[PDB]
Amino acid sequence: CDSPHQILDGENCTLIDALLGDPQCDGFQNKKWDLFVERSKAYSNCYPYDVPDYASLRSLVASSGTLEFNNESFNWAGVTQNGTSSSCRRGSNSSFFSRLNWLTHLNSKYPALNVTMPNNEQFDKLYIWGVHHPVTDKDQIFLYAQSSGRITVSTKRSQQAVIPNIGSRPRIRDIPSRISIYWTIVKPGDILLINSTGNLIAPRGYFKIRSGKSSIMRSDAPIGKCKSECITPNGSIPNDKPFQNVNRITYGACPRYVKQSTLKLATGMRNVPEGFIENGWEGMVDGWYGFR
């Protein structure tokens, strides 16, 4: 039931692919939600990528419950922005993740990027970026002039550093390269620092993080027009009875999962078919106790 809690159907798309901007998931841009509905038919059509602590990234973004995104402008010195690959086709032409910028060499040179971007606002800024893992040394040189890459995303509180690992990977969408995605949060008054020499697929900005009631649910259930305070992967249930047997997974004002298939609560007295000591009177109807 959609009415009480704002449902967002993740049709054909995962939550991470929508965040990154898989061309299918363009419709989800800057849309907020109360509960996301990951589908099992959902697939990833874009560049092959893995992301360490995927579950944490997924669970963190779901708790915020919004893909609101404001673009920021970085002066990428002497590098070719908007890098594209045939792996993520877009209608006719080839393209890339909508929220990431593939930085490659410009005129056979890759200068060390030392870029800065502060956070003057009172709320936390979440930047989503990654690193490219070229399949072979030849592909590495072809993309970036220098031979070995180095990426160090820093902030006043913490620092992340990744080294690209070159090697063969199984061809998926005919692309044997890989991409490791990471995330960094920039607290207010803090400042983001990126010093890279290459292999950097830098971001196009930050996602506005709100600490909210939203969550996620893996389900193949359809959605209809109705009002029900509970949502389970099997479907929506009513919150009348205080115990449920449907599913371990709940969302909202829901009864607690019990192994028992049924629990009969007595609402009348002991039924004794035919004074009172021997049996009760079946004929009596207007009341419960009486005189004959």
Epitope: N71, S73, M117, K208
Partner: antibody, heavy 129, light 109 residues
């Protein structure tokens, strides 16, 4: 070492739209509030509008709603278009930076600053035919 | 021009000057103040941000003040290079920026 350089046309036919940009250097355009101010012989020194990457924007009422401030990320420029130009609109047009406000607003964004940090030289626009 | 300031003042080199900036209570009484110097043919420069504070590279020679509806800019020990126009300005009620008329500072001697 942040600088501004206002690129602009020299003349503009009356009742037409006026295109304008100023290039920013050594600083992301999204990091500060920007506003345009224009100086004219007569009619004082006139602020027109301010912008911020949030989308917050205020225009001066004395200039009709014809002015619309944009800002662009690819070229790292902040831009300004004003349609239906009259003869009065002739002036030098400069872009300038606000002092960071150091106190957010409703919904978390930084407010516009109470002072103009630095100015570009500016470009003279002439309303001639 | 909802901010009043005298068109021109004059003083010998090495002396003090006072530029007043009269306004209503809707602007200065509520908001802060800023002073801007525009040397001839150059982009206007900021001289005093907020009420008494001066940016880096602005000598303590320049000094500012506020008092209800009026604001005051002061310069001790004048140089010939200080000949310029000086603008006071601030926000008002409607959050629209207003500058003063202008003050053409001439230095004699």
């Amino acid at each position: 070492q942040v600088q501004l350089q206002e690129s602009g046309p020299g003349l503009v036919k009356p009742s037409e739209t006026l295109s304008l940009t100023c290039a920013v250097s050594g600083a992301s355009i999204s990091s500060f509030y920007w506003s345009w101010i224009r100086q004219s012989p007569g009619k004082g020194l006139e602020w027109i509008a301010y912008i911020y990457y949030s989308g917050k924007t205020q225009y001066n009422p004395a200039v009709t709603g014809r002015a619309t401030i944009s800002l662009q990320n690819w070229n790292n420029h902040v831009a300004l278009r004003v349609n239906s130009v009259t003869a009065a609109d002739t002036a030098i047009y400069s872009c300038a930076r606000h002092t960071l406000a150091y106190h957010y607003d409703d919904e978390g964004y930084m407010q516009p600053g109470d002072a103009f940090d630095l100015w570009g030289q500016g470009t003279m626009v002439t309303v001639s035919s | 021009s909802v901010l009043t300031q005298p068109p021109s003042v004059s003083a010998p080199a090495g002396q003090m000057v006072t530029i007043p900036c009269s306004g209503s209570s809707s602007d200065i009484g509520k908001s802060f103040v800023s002073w801007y110097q525009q040397l001839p043919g150059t982009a206007p420069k900021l001289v005093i941000y907020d009420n008494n504070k001066r940016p880096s590279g602005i000598p303590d020679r320049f000094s500012g003040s506020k008092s209800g509806t009026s604001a005051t800019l002061g310069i001790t020990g004048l140089q010939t290079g200080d000949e310029a126009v000086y603008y006071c300005g601030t926000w008002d009620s409607s959050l629209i920026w207003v500058f003063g008329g202008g003050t053409k500072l001439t230095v004699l001697g």
